[PDB]
Design a protein around this ligand. Structure first.
Ligand SMILES: OC[C@H]1O[C@H](O[C@H]2[C@H](O)[C@@H](O)[C@@H](O)O[C@@H]2CO)[C@H](O)[C@@H](O)[C@@H]1O
Length: 652
């Protein structure tokens, strides 16, 4: 949980976090409240992961475009500055942090990309993108290059894509039309194609990221870069004579950067809300606070009127606002994360040659418009990680006798014998039944790790790597051959190498089953689904407690048990037990249903195998369909952590 009496702050590593820490040291001097300023990697994705369960920082610093989604998920508290304080900051910056009428963050600064160029290598910067290829040939003759900027984040490529007609969502009548995405019109195609032709003609490198581009410019190797005001600090250090100017035009149109408002949100689960307000209103959002941060890494055009009226005299800040005006302030709607994931994939795939520009942007238009999912039940379990582990026997042995219960206890032991094992790890063995193995034979099983289970996965990796010594069937007669990433189907050695099944992958998969409205639900391993509680007060006993006939299965029973699983996972993570709503009605017809008996001299292994046809409405809630899709990867019913209750969605 978040510790009361102190303040923990998250801000991106490219920002002036040391400056921010000095503002925190002054706060601690005046109130005794310790202020810890951290800068995690991928924090815009890390915040929902930890905040969904009640952890994370007291204050989060990011551009405003992520905050509507945070607010929609109930991660942010409503800030309450009086009218006197609101007048100190620009009204349009307050607009950027408003969501459904409520202010959800304190605006800090307005960030916009500008063209940064080496005045010594390039006295007159190019006014148009079309000049850059010709310019690069001349510079390559001196062993230099024209332009290098981060091609891994669509933030940096969007000004070009938007120049000739690209847009995120059409805005009319106070509303963004999610179904009207503009990443796939003639102008977006022209912009990305020009980017790809730069790479194809050796004027840029598809691999270029933020570090490579910053290093090249600051070491005098490239004449131009594209970055924001935070980057200026490192350039002053490198003693490059640089300037900040307007972005080049494309087809006569100016480049249109998506402008962000760096904002500070207050975690909804923070017990230090009043302290957070005092730090932000009375210490950071003052002339001396922002200056301490600006001195470390320049903020840009700050939202505080009194300070910005002095900074605007800086020609670099003026250029920042010039590019900003030629662009647009980002929407803060929850769909922005769907947009940025779509365009990130589009630009990487097009630039790497994997997809054509037309195909890459066609998929991005579909992806950007996919129905969001902001469920607390889902944010608690995502992201998933999964591995298939291959062992080799060191002497003969028998498996299947305990019906994979020994494997479970063994993996639990190898994970540190932790508390709440079943709430974070699912153990799915290969369904062989009874097998006798010889020395040298392989043994394979899959384990899926839910959000909050990395340390368990780390202990597991170490134990496996130290077999057979680790163990002290499934004893110290096994050795690790390899660990494969279930989702990439290739080998890994450290946890950091593992891919994730995250919210964006789930939204894309859910959309597939949204459009195909009829589909089948089939159990791979038997399910132990308890029958509904008799309404006359009596309790069911014995094997009569569980569903086993076609007549026992219906749409409400199935979705109740599925949701029970998610509620339990949520409860054990947070302590709260959410109230269980009923799903909208749908057609569910059980085609096949039979009960398997798997008792061994204990009946835990027995369960029901079933196939169900589903039909859903056009307007069926996506965040519920998403529970159905996610349930494929975590299983439902009793003993789901032993691999029971595994189902998969198939087409009819
Ligand atoms: O590239 C997608 C990414 O763009 C923006 O992130 C910016 C951020 O606004 C700046 O403060 C700075 O850190 O550069 C980031 C790009 O790496 C959006 O704010 C973000 O939502 C989006 O995913």
């Amino acid at each position: 949980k978040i510790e009361e009496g102190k303040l923990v702050i998250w801000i991106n590593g490219d920002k002036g976090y040391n400056g921010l820490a000095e503002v925190g040291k002054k706060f601690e001097k005046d109130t005794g409240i310790k202020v810890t300023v951290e800068h995690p990697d991928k924090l815009e994705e890390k915040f929902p992961q930890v905040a969904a369960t009640g952890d994370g920082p007291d204050i989060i610093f990011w551009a405003h475009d992520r905050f509507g989604g945070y607010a929609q998920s109930g991660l942010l508290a409503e800030i309450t500055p009086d009218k006197a304080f609101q007048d100190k900051l620009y009204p349009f910056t307050w607009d950027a942090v408003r969501y459904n009428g409520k202010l959800i963050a304190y605006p800090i600064a307005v960030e916009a990309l500008s063209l940064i160029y080496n005045k010594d290598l390039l006295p007159n910067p190019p006014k148009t993108w079309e000049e850059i290829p010709a310019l690069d040939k001349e510079l390559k003759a001196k062993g230099k290059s024209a332009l290098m900027f981060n091609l891994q984040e669509p933030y940096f490529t969007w000004p070009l894509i938007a120049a000739d007609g690209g847009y995120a969502f059409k805005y009319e009548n106070g509303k963004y039309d999610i179904k009207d995405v503009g990443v796939d019109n003639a102008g977006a195609k022209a912009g990305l194609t020009f980017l790809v032709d730069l790479i194809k003609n050796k004027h840029m490198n598809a691999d270029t990221d933020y570090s490579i581009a910053e290093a090249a410019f600051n070491k005098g190797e490239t004449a131009m870069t594209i970055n924001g005001p935070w980057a200026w600090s490192n350039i002053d250090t490198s003693k490059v004579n640089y300037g900040v100017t307007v972005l080049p035009t494309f087809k006569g149109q100016p480049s249109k950067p998506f402008v962000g408002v760096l904002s500070a949100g207050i975690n909804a689960a923070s017990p230090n809300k009043e302290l957070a307000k005092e730090f932000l209103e009375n210490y950071l959002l003052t002339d001396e606070g922002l200056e301490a941060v600006n001195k470390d890494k320049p903020l840009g055009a700050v939202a505080l009127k009194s300070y910005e009226e002095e900074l605007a005299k800086d020609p670099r800040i003026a250029a920042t606002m010039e590019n900003a005006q030629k662009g647009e302030i980002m929407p803060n709607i929850p769909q922005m994360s769907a947009f940025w994931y779509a365009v990130r994939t589009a630009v990487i795939n097009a630039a790497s040659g994997r997809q054509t520009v037309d195909a890459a942007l066609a998929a991005a238009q579909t992806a950007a418009a996919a129905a969001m999912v902001n469920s607390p039940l889902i944010d608690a379990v995502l992201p998933l990680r999964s591995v298939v582990i291959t062992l080799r026997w060191l002497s003969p042995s028998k498996t299947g006798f305990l019906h994979h219960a020994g494997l479970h206890a063994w993996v639990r032991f190898l994970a540190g014998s932790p508390e709440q094992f079943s709430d974070f790890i699912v153990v799915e063995p290969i369904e062989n039944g009874h097998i006798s193995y010889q020395a040298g034979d392989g043994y394979r099983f899959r384990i899926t790790v839910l959000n909050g289970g990395e340390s368990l996965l780390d202990t597991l990796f170490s134990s496996l790597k130290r077999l057979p010594e680790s163990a002290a069937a499934f004893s110290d007669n096994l050795v690790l051959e390899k660990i494969e990433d279930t989702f990439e189907h290739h080998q890994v050695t450290q946890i950091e190498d593992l891919s994730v099944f995250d919210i964006n992958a789930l939204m894309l998969e859910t959309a597939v089953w949204s459009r195909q409205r009829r589909f089948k639900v089939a159990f791979n391993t038997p399910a132990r689904l308890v029958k509904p509680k008799p309404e006359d007060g009596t309790e069911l006993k014995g094997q009569n407690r569980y569903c086993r006939d076609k007549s026992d299965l219906n749409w409400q029973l199935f979705t109740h048990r599925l949701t029970d699983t998610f509620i339990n996972l949520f409860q054990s993570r947070t302590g709260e037990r959410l109230q269980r709503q009923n799903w909208p009605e749908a057609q569910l017809h059980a085609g096949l249903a039979v009960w398997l008996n798997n008792s061994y001299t204990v009946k835990d292994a027995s369960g029901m195998l079933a196939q169900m046809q589903i039909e859903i409405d056009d307007d069926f809630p996506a965040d519920l369909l998403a529970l159905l899709v996610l349930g494929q990867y975590i299983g439902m019913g009793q003993n789901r952590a032993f691999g029971m209750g595994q189902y998969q969605l198939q087409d009819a």
